[PDB]
């Protein structure tokens, strides 16, 4: 099989979220337990989540470093400047035969409700409750969890732009967040319709595992849109040690 076609490389799924939907969580409120970004999945080929490694240069200075978990479609879009693709998702619930509930997955296009921190961007679950953000007009799927487990969602490319940026979470913070919003055009939001109904002889948790890949992928420009070069993060041996810093001067 031609293992280098953009179809074949981006059609490799990868797990972006493993959520935790408790029996205590409220209805019409996005599932935010465990992982960052909660039950808010930005629909898009670039990467949206990053960790920050902080080490010491001196006693009065810290050197930060942004580390990004890449899916095999998010790793290819970083090579290019603009993207356009039909994004596919497979939302899978890890449960027994005795956990029953209902789950809502709606698509909301445009700007994502986010909390810009001083060094990173997180979502805003306060603006996605059932009161302030009704899902009565969105495209939604109401998954039943009495027997059924999986659902595959194919979100096409909808925007007012012919292509979206591939910058994503690179260098995104409070001081700079424009290129983050212009990279996705939408977000899936996972909220419970019915609270998780479970007996006492089973666990009080289920897990929602979200796979991610892409179809019908076109890309534009063979230059990365990021400020620095594409650099693979080589993990250091000890937490105190440092990393490689690639320059930009010629």
């Amino acid at each position: 099989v031609d293992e280098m076609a953009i179809g074949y490389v981006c059609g490799n799924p990868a797990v972006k979220h493993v959520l935790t939907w408790k029996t205590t969580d409220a209805i019409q409120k996005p599932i935010a337990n465990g992982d960052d970004w909660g039950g808010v999945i930005p629909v898009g080929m670039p990467c949206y989540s990053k960790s920050i490694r902080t080490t010491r240069i001196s006693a009065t200075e810290n050197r930060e470093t942004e580390v990004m978990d890449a899916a095999p479609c998010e790793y290819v879009a970083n090579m290019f400047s603009y993207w356009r693709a039909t994004m596919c998702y497979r939302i899978t619930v890890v449960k027994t035969a005795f956990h029953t509930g209902r789950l809502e997955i709606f698509f909301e296009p445009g700007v994502i409700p986010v909390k810009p921190t001083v060094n990173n961007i997180g979502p805003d679950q306060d603006r996605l409750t059932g009161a302030v953000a009704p899902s009565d007009n969105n495209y939604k799927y109401i998954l039943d969890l009495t027997n059924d487990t999986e659902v595959t969602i194919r979100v096409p490319f909808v925007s007012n732009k012919m292509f979206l940026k591939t910058a994503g979470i690179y260098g995104a913070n409070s001081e700079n967040n424009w290129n983050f919003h212009e990279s996705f055009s939408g977000f899936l939001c996972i909220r419970p319709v019915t609270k998780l109904m479970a007996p006492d002889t089973v666990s009080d948790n289920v897990s929602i595992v979200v796979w991610k890949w892409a179809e019908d992928v076109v890309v534009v420009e063979p230059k990365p849109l990021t400020s620095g070069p594409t650099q693979v993060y080589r993990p250091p041996p000890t937490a105190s040690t440092a990393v490689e810093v690639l320059n930009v001067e010629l």
Binding site: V1, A5, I6, G7, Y8, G11, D216, V217
Partner: protein, 57 residues
């Protein structure tokens, strides 16, 4: 059969397979380029064959 005001454009091309080039369908590799062990690679074709240039003449 291609609209271009330059006389012959570039790098004369061979042929391939019947599918869409992206959008997953498991593209076979042997079908893409058409050079198996035969009279189609020019160095095995020169000794199958046996032209005068493989002998230094």
């Amino acid at each position: 059969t291609s609209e271009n005001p330059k006389i012959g454009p570039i790098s004369e091309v061979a042929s391939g397979v019947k599918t869409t080039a992206n959008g997953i369908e498991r593209i076979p590799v042997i079908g893409e380029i058409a050079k198996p062990v035969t009279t189609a690679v020019k160095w095995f074709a020169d000794v199958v064959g046996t032209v005068a240039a493989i002998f230094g003449w």
